[PDB]
Design a protein around this ligand. Structure first.
Ligand code: MG
Ligand code: MG
Ligand code: MG
Ligand code: MG
Lengths: 339, 339, 339, 339
C-alpha cells in the first residue's frame, strides 16, 4: 500500500558473467533461470516488480562477491571501472526510478577514492557498496580490511562528497572457508557467515577509531545490522565497563550506542521480521533503519508485502519506508516520492 | 528478591594455574587481584555472593579456554581428569549449593564419553561444559568440531545419561586469530568473537543432523544464544525456503524453530538486558531460557540485581530464574529451591 | 497450519431471537444476513469454517448481552435454563468438536450457583461465560457486580467443580450509556466500552479479595485482557507503592502479578496483533494466554490466518494454540488434539 | 545522566486550598505532610529535585480535579483566572526553569477560548491542561465534553495560537462514581478510572471529527496514552473493517493511526516501564512520546532514575527526553537544553 518506497541493497550482474552468475545461483537460488534473467535485467522486469509493489526508487549495486573476488589489482580496477560505466548508462533509462552505488576495487585507498569520486562527480552515484574485504595476495587468500589509518584518505573522500558506504557481505574463501565452513557449508551466506564477516569489519571500524577520525562518515549494514543490535547491551557493557579501562579508549572515543546514533545505519534487507524490526527500533531507533529488499536473492513480494502489511505506526512506516533514505541520500522527487 | 535461583555458567580455575589466570584476567578483568581470588575460590567468597543475591544452586565449570587449549591429547586428558576429581572434592563442602559440569578433553569421541560417564556415574555431575573446538595438530592451530558422525558415540552417551551439553566460547588462536582478529583485538571475547565461534559450532550440529540422530540431546548456549535468536527468522527463511531445496534437507530434517523447541537452550549469562530477554522470549520461548551469571567475569550484583528487578511476569520469572533449570537438571531440593 | 486449535469465545443465539440478533448486527456486522445465519448455526457452517482453519475444538457460549440484559429475574432464569438445555442438545451432534459454557442469570448467587452446577453435572459444560454485570432493578438501570461476599457461594461452586469463569463484555445501558457513550456511540463495543466494563469488574474482584477467599478460582478475559496488561506496571505500582499502604491490603492480599500468575487468563479474541501478543507474553506470560476468535463478530479467516502465520516460537504457538486450554479444561481427545 | 530533560505533567495547588489538598492526598499519597509542601512549592523544593535529576524545564499545571470540579460557572471562571494570574507570577522567579499551561473553566467554549488566549498572549503560557470533563448542572452531576461542534471556536483558538491541549484525568463523581466505582474504590485514579475517562474523551474527539475540522490541533495524553496504544490494532480494526462501513466515516475521516501520527501525543507520566515504552514505540512511535513525571503524585527519583538508566537507543532517549517537547512547544534555551 505504501508508495514511493526506497530500496538500496539491490544487485545486478554484467551479462558477460553468466557462468559465474549461474554458479552463484546454484548456492543461493531455487530458480536459476529466473535468477539469471532478474539479476542481469535493469529496466524491464525490475521496474515491473517495483511498479507492482510500491517501490519508487532503487539504488542499484553490483552482486557479491563482485570486484572483491578479484585479487589481481589491475583486473579488479578495470572491472570496477567497467561496471560503473555500464550501470551509469543503464540507469539513464529511468533516472526517477534508479540510482547507483559505486563499485570499487579496494586494493588501494587512493585508487578507490578516485573511482568513487569519479562515480559521484561524473555520474551522480549515491555512495559506495563494497562486499566486505578485498581479496588479495598470490592466490586470493589474503584479505584487505579498511579499518586502519591507510584508509583515512578514502573515508575522508566519503565525507567530503558526503555519501554513505554500504558494507555488504561476501562468501568465505580459501583458508577461512576450509577451516571453518567446508564441514558445515549450508551455513555459508545468509544463514550465518555473511553477518560474521560484516559485523567483524564494521566493529573493527568502530574500535579502530574510523568514526573518531571521520565523525561524519555514514556506514550502512544490511539484514538489520548483522547481529549487532542483538548484542548492543553486551557490546556496550564489554566496552564501557571492561575494555575501555584496559586500553580500548585509546582508539575509540564514543560508545557503541553513540556510533549507531551518529554513523551507522541498518536496513531490512533479507530480514522481513516485524518482531526483530521492533527490537531493532528499540536498540537503534526507527530513525536509523531503512527499507531494503536484497533483490533478486529475495523477491519484491516477500519484502514489500511484509513491510506494507506489518503492524507499525504511521510515523515510522514513512521514515523506514522512504523518508530516512530520502534525507540521507539527499533525494528530491523520484516516482511517488511524496505519495 | 527471588530466592533459590540457579546459575550454571560459573567458572573456576585450578590454584596451580595462577600465571595463566592472570594473563587471561589482563584481557577480561579490570581488577586482576579480585579475579584471581574469585576464580579460584569455591566455598567462601562464592557462597557469600550467592547468599547475598538469592542464588540457591550453581553448576560450576572450568574457565575457558580450559582443556580445549591443550593440543597434546595425553596432557589434555590428564588435565581434565585432574579438574574433575578436584571440583568433585570441592563441591562436597556444600552439596545443596553446588553441582558441577564435566570438564573434558575432546580429542577423541570415546575418551570424552568415558570421562563424562565417569563424572556422571561416580560424582553425579550434571552434564558437560566444553569451550567450543578442541585445539589439535602440531602447534595447536587445528580445531576439532563435534558436528559429525565420529561423535555419535559421544552424543549417544549424553542422551543415555540424559545430561545436557553446554557449548561455551573460547578465544580465537593461531591462523584464525592472526587473520581476522589481531588487527581488531578489542573485539576478542564477549564483544564479538565468542558468539561467532559458538553459533558456528551449534548451527553446524543443526545442519549436520546431530539432533536428527540424537533427538533427545540437550544443548545449552550462553549469552542469550550467541546472536542466533536475532536471526531466527532469517535462518528459518534461508533454510526452509532456500537451502532445504538445494540439498540441506538430506542432513537436517527439522526447522531451526523445532530445534529450539526440542533441543537447544539459551542462558542469560553476560547479557543482562530485559529488552533482549523479551525479544528472546518471543523467538525461543520463556520455557527454553535459563538464568546464569558468567561469574567471575561478570559479577553476581550485575546479574542478580538485573534479573530480580526486571519487569517480568511472575510465571516466567520463576521459570527462567530456577524452574526451567530445575526440571532440566532433575534437581530436587537445594537451598531455597521452593522459596 | 497449526491443527487442533481450541477457541473459546465463540457465540451463538437462539433462532427465536432473530429480531434481537439483527439489531445487534446493525451495530457490529457489515453483513447482517451472513451474521444471522452464522450466529444461529452450530453444526454446519461453524464446522466447515473450523475444518478449513485448523480449529479442532470450540467451547460455545451465548451472545451478548444475553441473559445479563434481562432484569426480570424470573424471565432471566428461564431464558438461562432454556439456553443451556438447547446448546447441550446441539453439541451432542458433534461432541468431539464442541463444548459449552453455562449461560446464567446472575440475579441471585445461589440461583446462579445451582444452574452452573446442573450444567456441569448434567451436561458436562466446561465453565461459565457471563456478559459482565447483570441488569437489575425496576427498569434495568441497576447493575449487579459479583466482586463481594454475597457471591462467595457462587465462586466456591466454580472452585468445587474446578471450571473457569469467562468475564465477557456487554454494551453499556441506561444512565451509563446516556451519560458517557450516547454522544460518542461509535466507541461502544470493541473500540472501547467493552474493555472498560470487563477490566473494572475483574479488577474489582482483585481488590475486593475474591481471589483471596477463592485462591483456586480461574477467571478468563477476552481481547488480550481488556487493557489490563498495558497498565500492569502502573497498576502494580499504584497498588504496592501506594494504595496498599492506605487500606487496600485489608481486602487484597497479593500483587496484581500474582493474580495473573495464579488466577487470571487472557485470550486472543478479537485482537489479532503479534506485536500486542508479544507484549502480553512479557506482561502476563505465554502460559496464561489462550487462542480464541470471537466468532461470528470476527471471522475464522482473520483469527486463524493471523495466528497460523504469526512469527512465534514453536513452544508458545503450541501452548497458546491448544495446550494451555487442553490442561485448564481437562480436555479429552478431540479432532487433531495431538496433530 | 541525561541533562536538560523536559517534564510537562507537573502539578501545583494554591496555598489557600490546603484542606482540599490534604483530602486528595489521603487518596493518593503515603506521606501527606510532604505532599502538601511539595504540591504548593514552586521555586525551592521543586527546583532542588529538578537539579538533582537532570530536569532543565518544567511546564506546570493545576492539580486535579481543579477547576473541572466546580459546577458554578461564575465561581469556576474566577478560580481559573485566579490560578493563571498566580502561576504567571510564580514562574517569573525562574523563567528559564518553568513554563505553565493555562488553567481553564470549560463551562463555555467562548469563555474558555478567551482565557486561553489571555494566558498565551499576556503571559506566554504554552498551552492548556484540563482535567477531563467540566462538572456542570445544579449539583455537578452533569459532564461537559468538548468533542462536538459547539467547541470549534475553542479548538480553533488552540490552532490559531499553535499550542497543545493536555487532556488530564480526574476522579469520577456523582452518579458515575456511585454506580461503577464506589464498590471498588481502590481502582479510582491511576489504577483504572483515570485512563477510562481520558481515553473516552480523546477517542470521542477522534470519532466526532474534531481533528478533521482542526487538523493542526495537538492533544496530549499522560500515562503512556491511557490504554489506547494497547488497543491500536483492535480500535483500528473495529474502525476501518467495521464501524467505518456503518456510519463512522461520516464524522471521522482518517484512521486512528493517522491521528496518532498527526494530532495525538503521549507522555511517560506515571508509567515508568521500559517494556511498555518499547511497545508504545512500536504502536505510536518515538517521535510522539514525551518524557514527564506526574509530580508530586510521583517522585522525580522514580521517574528520572527509570528514564536515565533505561536501556534505550541514543536517538530516542534524546527525543523523548527533551527534543520532541523542545519542538512542539517552540522552546528557547533553558537550563542544559543542549547539554
Ligand atoms: Mg544483498
Ligand atoms: Mg562464561
Ligand atoms: Mg466476544
Ligand atoms: Mg497527573
Amino acid at each position: 500500500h505504501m508508495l514511493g518506497k526506497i530500496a538500496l541493497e539491490e544487485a545486478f550482474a554484467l551479462p558477460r558473467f553468466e557462468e559465474k552468475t549461474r554458479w552463484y545461483a546454484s548456492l543461493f537460488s531455487t530458480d536459476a533461470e529466473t535468477h539469471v534473467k532478474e539479476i542481469t535485467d535493469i529496466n524491464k522486469i525490475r521496474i515491473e516488480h517495483a511498479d507492482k509493489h510500491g517501490v519508487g526508487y532503487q539504488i542499484l549495486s553490483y552482486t557479491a562477491p563482485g570486484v572483491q573476488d578479484i585479487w589481481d589489482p589491475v583486473e579488479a580496477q578495470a572491472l570496477a571501472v567497467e561496471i560503473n560505466d555500464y550501470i551509469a548508462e543503464q540507469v539513464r533509462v529511468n533516472p526517477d526510478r534508479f540510482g547507483a552505488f559505486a563499485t570499487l576495487s579496494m586494493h588501494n585507498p587512493k585508487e578507490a577514492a578516485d573511482e568513487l569520486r569519479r562515480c559521484v562527480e561524473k555520474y551522480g552515484f549515491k555512495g559506495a557498496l563494497v562486499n566486505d574485504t578485498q581479496r588479495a595476495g598470490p592466490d586470493g587468500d589474503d584479505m584487505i580490511f579498511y579499518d586502519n589509518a591507510d584508509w583515512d584518505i578514502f573515508w575522508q573522500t566519503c565525507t567530503e562528497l558526503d555519501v554513505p558506504f554500504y558494507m555488504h557481505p561476501r562468501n568465505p574463501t580459501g583458508t577461512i572457508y576450509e577451516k571453518l565452513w567446508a564441514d558445515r557449508k549450508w551455513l555459508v551466506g545468509p544463514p550465518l557467515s555473511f553477518a560474521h564477516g560484516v559485523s567483524l569489519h564494521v566493529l573493527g571500524m568502530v574500535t579502530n577509531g574510523v568514526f573518531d577520525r571521520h565523525p561524519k562518515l555514514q556506514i550502512i549494514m544490511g539484514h538489520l545490522g548483522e547481529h549487532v543490535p542483538f548484542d548492543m547491551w553486551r557490546i556496550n557493557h564489554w566496552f564501557e565497563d571492561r575494555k575501555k579501562l584496559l586500553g580500548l579508549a585509546e582508539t575509540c572515543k564514543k560508545t557503541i550506542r553513540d556510533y549507531f546514533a551518529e554513523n551507522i545505519w541498518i536496513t531490512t534487507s533479507g530480514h522481513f521480521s516485524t518482531t526483530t524490526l521492533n527490537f531493532c527500533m528499540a536498540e537503534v531507533g526507527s530513525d536509523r533503519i531503512l527499507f531494503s529488499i536484497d533483490y533478486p536473492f529475495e523477491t519484491f513480494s516477500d519484502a514489500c508485502e511484509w513491510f506494507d502489511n506489518a503492524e507499525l505506526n504511521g510515523t515510522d512506516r514513512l521514515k523506514i519506508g522512504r523518508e530516512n533514505a530520502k534525507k540521507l541520500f539527499k533525494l528530491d522527487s523520484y516516482k511517488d516520492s511524496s505519495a
